[PDB]
Nucleic acid binder design. Structure first.
Ligand SMILES: Nc1ncnc2c1ncn2[C@H]1C[C@H](O)[C@@H](COP(=O)(O)C(F)(F)P(=O)(O)OP(=O)(O)O)O1
Ligand SMILES: [Cl-]
Ligand SMILES: [Cl-]
Ligand SMILES: [Cl-]
Ligand SMILES: [Cl-]
Ligand SMILES: [Mg+2]
Ligand SMILES: [Mg+2]
Ligand code: NA
Ligand code: NA
Length: 326
DNA sequence: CCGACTGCGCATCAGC
DNA sequence: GCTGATGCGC
DNA sequence: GTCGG
């Protein structure tokens, strides 16, 4: 946090653009700039100096000059005082309420926590659960609890079928001392890019975790992705732990390396890495890396036997999980 | 100058 | 019902 | 909002 002030500013600007202006490219540009500045190993003394960094252009350099001179940004001060942007910004803090629904609710006079609570019937299932756990989903997860949750998830999975492999990814795999949620990558020999010889592979695991009261609510659920809410058991007399967000992704077993690469992140690291891939004539998703023909059509998946293999294809030196926190 | 900007699962909706 | 587009979040 | 060609 050499430049915590500046990165916060840009982050607030990204969120404004996404939530209020609904300008996805500006949102991503701001996030990119924040990221590159976050990792810059010097305390920035000027906008010119920041403008040397890829992703920081003229407009951002200017805002940086203002913030350095004043400790603030007029543009943001104004935004913070605009009732409508304020209302939309808060409303999108509820899981399931996006830029669109937020703006709608405001239109309809629903713009506070109290408003949402008395208008539950105007929420879809996801939003309803987001509202229910609005406070909990605010709280970070200490690594020590992530370890307990890991322990539970891995053992319960083993109980359904010893052939399942569950890997906790996200910031936890990057070594973070705290996490926003729990991301579980799941594989089983019966599900490969070649065939699905067992149905309900994801369901049985979800059901087991529900049976033991680890999973408490469901936000969405398909054949390969589950998104929901979980909770650690507390002891006699002990207050309860906050409810936590959990995501599970069932990935074909032979595409584990692309899968774990994807799910380890960070989200900006993936974006960067995928952009570079393109510039090298490849496209990467959570399943495969393929070449991009002259015509732009992606070709056949290339052989992959390690995360590193994927880095090699794009002429990047390998980066351990802990060094992918962008 | 200007096209392009990482990639995708699930929920919901519109048009047929 | 189906398919495609859009919303949301990973 | 930024950038590559
Ligand atoms: N927009 C994206 N593009 C590509 N990969 C993504 C994207 N968003 C997420 N992933 C990836 C890569 C991610 O690391 C992973 C989990 O997404 P989470 O939404 O749980 C996260 F990003 F917040 P995490 O890194 O885990 O940080 P905490 O959750 O706060 O602790 O899927
Ligand atoms: Cl935009
Ligand atoms: Cl400010
Ligand atoms: Cl793979
Ligand atoms: Cl693919
Ligand atoms: Mg996570
Ligand atoms: Mg997650
Ligand atoms: Na720059
Ligand atoms: Na939200």
């Amino acid at each position: 946090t050499l430049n915590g002030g500046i990165t916060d500013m840009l982050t607030e600007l990204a969120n404004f653009e996404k939530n209020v202006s609904q300008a996805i490219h500006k949102y991503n540009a701001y996030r990119k700039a924040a990221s590159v500045i976050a990792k810059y190993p010097h305390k920035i003394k000027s906008g010119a100096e920041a403008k040397k960094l890829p992703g920081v252009g003229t407009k951002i350099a200017e805002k940086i000059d203002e913030f350095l001179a004043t400790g603030k940004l007029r543009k943001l001060e104004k935004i913070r005082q605009d009732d409508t942007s304020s209302s939309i910004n808060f409303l999108t803090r509820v899981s399931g309420i996006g830029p669109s629904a937020a703006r709608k609710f405001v239109d309809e006079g629903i713009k506070t926590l109290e408003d949402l609570r008395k208008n539950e019937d105007k929420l879809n299932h996801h939003q309803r659960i987001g509202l229910k756990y609005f406070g909990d989903f605010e709280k970070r997860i200490p690594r020590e609890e992530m370890l307990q949750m890991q322990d539970i998830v891995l053992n319960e999975v083993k109980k359904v079928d010893s052939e399942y492999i569950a890997t906790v990814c996200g910031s936890f795999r990057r070594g973070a001392e705290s996490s926003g949620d729990m991301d579980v990558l799941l594989t089983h020999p019966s599900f490969t890019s070649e065939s699905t010889k067992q149905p309900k592979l994801l369901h049985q695991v979800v059901e087991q975790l529900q049976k033991v009261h680890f999973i408490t609510d469901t936000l969405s659920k398909g054949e390969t992705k589950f998104m929901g809410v979980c909770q650690l058991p507390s002891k006699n007399d002990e207050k309860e732990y906050p409810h936590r967000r959990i995501d599970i992704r069932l990935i074909p077993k032979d595409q584990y390396y692309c899968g774990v690469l994807y799910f380890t992140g960070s989200d900006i690291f993936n974006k960067n890495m995928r952009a570079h891939a393109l510039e090298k004539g490849f496209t990467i998703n959570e399943y495969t890396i393929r070449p991009l023909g002259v015509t732009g059509v992606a070709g056949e998946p290339l052989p992959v036997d390690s995360e590193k293999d994927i880095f090699d294809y794009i002429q990047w030196k390998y980066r351990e999980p802990k060094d992918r926190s962008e």
